[PDB]
């Protein structure tokens, strides 16, 4: 659904068509003007950062594994005559429709008997999904993956690509897959009895030399070398695929460009009348196009074990019954062609729709992981109460759409209760300790991180014990639309730390809430604060991120009693464009204000600019008003004359309109 | 007789034994003597038996 | 209907006898007995019993 | 809630017999007993006590 994913984008964000991606890492964000203030009994110290960049790093790598599951049939496409008043295939009108058609008379009785089983095999989501992946593999084919590269680095702990993804050879995305071609046979119209467990599709005119090569590779096993997101492992959809094309199927060309895959999709959707099938495949790919680079070192627990992708079995019986598909189809919603029409016009817009969906999910799974099991709406039972339909199993797209509904605070409506795609809530529901590997840089690591060893020499491979999952992404596109006090994503905020002159700089935060806001605002001001817990004896640093520049309470890496000693004569100025706290006395009052917002994207430590035309909000009415218009100007070549007009020179001629 | 779709591997064994002679050893009430109902039974199933 | 056209005249003649052969009571009776034989199959009968 | 509609007659027959005997109370009973054996697993029973 293009419509619901479009509304997630911010108001200030004005996207263009083309986006020239030339790397496997993008820092999307915005530039804002922060007017910071520090008030005290001595006086006020004002600062101003005119261009403050708040970013979330997003990569094109992520371990996924496809499995073939059984899903509901999508009945949108079949002629409206055979359907009854309630909206199910009234068998008796099917036998009537087949009898009054251009079918062979000896096949009518035997084909009608099979109809009861074969007409309820309508799900082309798996085919469209694979054909969409082939489009983006050939478009962004020049992106590279190095084996010994830095997945994450925060100064203390480092995590390499070798650690998370073993059995991984370095190669380009184009050179990753070597897809073998499945057989594309021609359906004989005079076949005695239809062959079930072999799908048959429709086609307009002649199957081109390149269309054979695309359909051949789409219905085949994906066995990748490099762990890419749009080239993950998928099982063999089918062995053989029939195509009811009276004009013969040309043999396989071998080569094809990304423009030829768009040609193949547009013919397949139009012939089969499968637009709702495409809408399902569009939302599936939106989840599993890009995966987020973790905010903290201990936020890598989400991407340790491979999340399963639920691909519904390829099943289509249109080739055997050409009569039942015509120009008057049955559809539930009137805006059922909107998702395809959006993709054909603006293919590269999927990148923006993808980051909008994963940012919405991973933000909400952040503040869902911090609720006790003894509650009404908890970790296990947040999907059941929200869903008001009848899906087969609460997995895939249902779990991701219900998290988006919680974030935006609106009602998401789909025409069919389809349960296909990636399932994210895997590591959460387990409710056990996860052992993430790490290579150390400094020697004073295991004070900060909950490490397995207490003394570790530099360059050693250690393990961190993560119990509660910290947030993987900070809200950026969904900044101050549905604000919570955990993230504290306000435009205006203030904190009041109360100290007396008798205290020699040392302040104890009994409250946990205002400790989080103090440590966060001090980092905007470019000050390196290092607090020490009095009960346990561990240490926390506000500088625990190089992207957002905020301090969340989950950076403590421990749930206990709150007694944080902060010594305010060991505060060090780290960044540029900073206010100085030289020597405070009395009550401190910190405050900031974010005024304006400008969309910015970075890649390879350089600005990535949006190019091409101005993207519009395509509606169903905007095309069918031109159908209402029809260009009703009678196609008659009316040539109008020009009267020559003489003036002073007479050498040169001058023509007038009347 | 008529049938919906394909006659399963077990449905053949049940219909085969139902249309046969009951020759019991012990005098049970639900296993009394019955003659052979029929020798052959046709099934109009386009999907093979 | 969806019948073979050469069979219509010969099948219609037989209809007078064959359409009045409708009694499946004997088949259902035997199939019900097979259900209960396999369900309560472990019951025993002794020859020299009271 | 399926595409393969050949298995519906078979599925219904088995489901009708099994749904009228569903009970997980005995499994949870033993799982609860295993929890408290591990937790309070340092209690001594002496045979020649009062």
From Swiss-Prot, chains C, D:
It comes from the Viruses. It is found in: Virion. Capsid protein self-assembles to form an icosahedral capsid with a T=2 symmetry, about 40 nm in diameter, and consisting of 60 capsid proteins asymmetric dimers. The capsid encapsulates the genomic dsRNA and the polymerase and remains intact following cell entry to protect the dsRNA from degradation and to prevent unfavorable antiviral responses in the host cell during all the replication cycle of the virus. Nascent transcripts are transcribed within the structural confines of the virion and are extruded into the cytoplasm. Belongs to the totivirus major capsid protein family. This is Major capsid protein. It comes from Saccharomyces cerevisiae virus L-BC (ScV-L-BC). The lineage of its organism: Viruses, Riboviria, Orthornavirae, Duplornaviricota, Chrymotiviricetes. The gene is gag.
């Amino acid at each position: 659904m293009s419509s619901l994913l479009n509304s997630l984008l911010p108001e200030y964000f004005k996207p263009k068509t083309n986006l020239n991606i030339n790397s496997s890492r993008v820092q999307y964000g915005f530039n804002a003007r922060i007017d910071m203030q520090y008030e005290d009994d001595s006086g006020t110290r004002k600062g101003s950062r005119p261009n403050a960049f708040m970013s979330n790093t997003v990569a094109f790598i992520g371990n996924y594994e496809g499995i073939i599951v059984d899903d509901i049939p999508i009945l949108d496409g079949l002629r409206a005559d055979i359907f009854d008043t309630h909206g199910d295939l009234d068998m008796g009108l099917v036998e009537d429709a087949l009898s009054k058609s251009t079918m062979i008379r000896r096949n009518v009785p035997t084909y009608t008997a099979y109809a009861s089983e074969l007409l309820y095999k309508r799900n082309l989501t798996s085919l469209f999904y694979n054909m969409l992946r082939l489009y983006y593999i050939k478009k962004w084919g020049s992106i590279k993956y190095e084996k010994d590269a830095i997945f994450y680095d925060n100064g203390h702990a480092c995590l390499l690509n070798r650690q998370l993804f073993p059995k991984s050879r370095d190669a380009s995305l184009e050179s990753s897959l070597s897809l073998p071609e499945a057989e594309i046979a021609m359906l004989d119209p005079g076949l005695e009895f239809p062959e079930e467990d072999v799908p048959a599709i429709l086609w307009h005119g002649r199957v081109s030399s390149r269309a054979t090569c695309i359909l051949g590779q789409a219905c085949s096993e994906f066995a990748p070398l490099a762990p890419f997101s749009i080239a993950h492992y998928s099982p063999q959809l089918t062995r053989k695929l029939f195509v009811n094309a009276p004009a013969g199927i040309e043999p396989s060309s071998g080569r094809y460009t990304h423009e030829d895959v768009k040609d193949a999709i547009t013919i397949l959707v139009s012939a089969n009348q499968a637009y709702t099938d495409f809408e399902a495949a569009y939302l599936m790919l939106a989840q599993t196009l890009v995966s987020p680079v973790p905010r903290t070192a201990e936020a890598s627990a989400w991407f340790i074990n491979a999340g399963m992708v639920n691909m519904p079995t390829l099943s289509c019986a249109n080739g055997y019954y050409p009569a039942l598909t015509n120009v008057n189809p049955y559809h539930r919603l009137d805006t059922w062609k909107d998702t395809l029409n959006h993709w054909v016009a603006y293919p590269d817009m999927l990148f923006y729709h993808s980051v909008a969906m994963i940012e919405s999910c991973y933000v909400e799974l952040g503040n869902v992981a911090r609720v006790s099991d003894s509650d009404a709406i908890n970790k296990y039972t947040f999907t059941e109460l929200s869903v008001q339909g009848r899906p087969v199993m609460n997995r895939g797209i249902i779990v991701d759409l219900t998290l988006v509904a919680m974030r935006t605070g609106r009602e998401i409506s789909l025409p069919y209760p389809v349960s296909c795609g990636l399932t994210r809530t895997d590591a959460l529901l387990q409710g056990t300790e996860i052992h993430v590997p790490v290579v150390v840089k400094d020697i004073d690591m295991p004070q900060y991180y909950n490490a397995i060893d207490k003394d570790v020499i530099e360059g050693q491979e250690t393990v961190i014990k993560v119990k509660q999952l910290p947030p993987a992404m900070y809200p950026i596109y969904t900044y101050g639309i549905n604000t919570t006090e955990f993230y504290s994503d306000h435009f205006e905020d203030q904190v009041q730390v109360e100290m007396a002159p008798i205290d020699n700089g040392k302040a104890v935060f009994n409250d946990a809430r205002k400790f989080s806001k103090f440590m966060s605002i001090m980092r905007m001001m470019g000050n390196d604060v290092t607090a020490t817990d009095l009960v346990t004896g561990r240490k926390v640093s506000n500088w625990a991120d190089n992207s957002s520049g905020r301090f969340l309470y989950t950076d403590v890496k421990y749930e206990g009693q709150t007694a944080f000693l902060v010594d305010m004569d060991t505060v060090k100025a780290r960044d540029h464009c900073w206010v100085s706290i030289v020597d405070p006395n009395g009550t401190m009052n910190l405050s900031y204000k974010m005024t304006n917002f400008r969309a910015a994207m970075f890649s390879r430590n350089k600005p990535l600019y949006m190019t091409g035309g101005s993207v519009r909000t395509i509606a169903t009415g905007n095309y069918r008003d031109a159908a209402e218009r029809l260009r009703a100007m009678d196609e008659t070549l009316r040539l109008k004359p020009f009267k020559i007009t003489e003036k002073l020179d007479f050498r040169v001629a001058a023509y007038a309109i009347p």
